[PDB]
A = this chain, B = another copy of it.
Amino acid sequence: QAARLRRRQLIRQLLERDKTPLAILFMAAVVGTLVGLAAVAFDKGVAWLQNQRMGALVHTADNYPLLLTVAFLCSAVLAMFGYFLVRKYAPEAGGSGIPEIEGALEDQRPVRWWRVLPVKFFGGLGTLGGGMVLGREGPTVQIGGNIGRMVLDIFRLKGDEARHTLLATGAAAGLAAAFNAPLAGILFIIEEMRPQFRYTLISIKAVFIGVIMSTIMYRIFNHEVALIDVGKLSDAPLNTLWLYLILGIIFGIFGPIFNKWVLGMQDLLHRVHGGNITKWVLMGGAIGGLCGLLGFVAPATSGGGFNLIPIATAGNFSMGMLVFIFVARVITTLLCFSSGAPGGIFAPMLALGTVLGTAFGMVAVELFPQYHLEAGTFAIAGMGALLAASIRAPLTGIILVLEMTDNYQLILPMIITGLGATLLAQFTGGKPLYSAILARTLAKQEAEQL
B408:A403 contact, CB within 8 angstroms? yes
Contacts of A17 in B (CB 8 A): 196, 392, 431-432, 435
* Chain A 4-38 interface 0/1 with B at a Cβ cutoff of 8 Å (1 = within): 00111011011111111010010000000000000
Contact of A11 among B18, B223, B399, B446 (CB under 8 A): B446
A212:B412 contact, CB within 8 angstroms? yes
The answer to the question of A177 belonging to the interface, with a C-beta cut-off of 8 Å to chain B, is no
Of the 9-residue stretches A54-62, A64-72, A152-160, A214-222, which lies at the interface with chain B? A214-222
Scan residues 415-450 of chain A and give those whose CB is less than 8 A from a CB of chain B: 415-416, 418-419, 422-423, 426-427, 431-432, 435-436, 438-439, 442-443, 445-446
Contacts of A426 in B (CB 8 A): 18-20, 205
Chain A contact residues: helix, strand, loop or mixed: helix
Contacts of A412 in B (CB 8 A): 182, 212, 215-216, 219
Contacts of A406 in B (CB 8 A): 408-409
The answer to the question of A328 belonging to the interface, with a C-beta cut-off of 8 Å to chain B, is no
B439:A212 contact, CB within 8 angstroms? no
Contacts of A431 in B (CB 8 A): 14-17
A183:B398 contact, CB within 8 angstroms? yes
Given A17-B196, A17-B432, are A423 and B8 neighbors across the interface (CB < 8 Å)? no
Question: How many angstroms between the C-alpha atoms of A59 and B422 in the bound complex?
Answer: 57
Contact of A422 among B18, B196, B416 (CB under 8 A): B18
A238:B216 contact, CB within 8 angstroms? yes
A208:B427 contact, CB within 8 angstroms? no
Question: How many angstroms between the C-alpha atoms of A113 and B16 in the bound complex?
Answer: 31
The smallest beta-carbon distance between A19 and chain B, in angstroms, is 6
B415:A18 contact, CB within 8 angstroms? no
6 closest A-B pairs by CB: A14-B439, A199-B199, A208-B419, A406-B408, A14-B435, A17-B435
Q: Can you list 22 A-B pairs, Cβ within 8 angstroms, ordered by A?
A: A6-B108, A10-B108, A11-B443, A11-B446, A13-B197, A14-B431, A14-B435, A14-B436, A15-B435, A17-B196, A17-B435, A19-B426, A25-B423, A183-B395, A205-B419, A205-B422, A212-B412, A215-B412, A219-B238, A219-B412, A403-B411, A406-B408
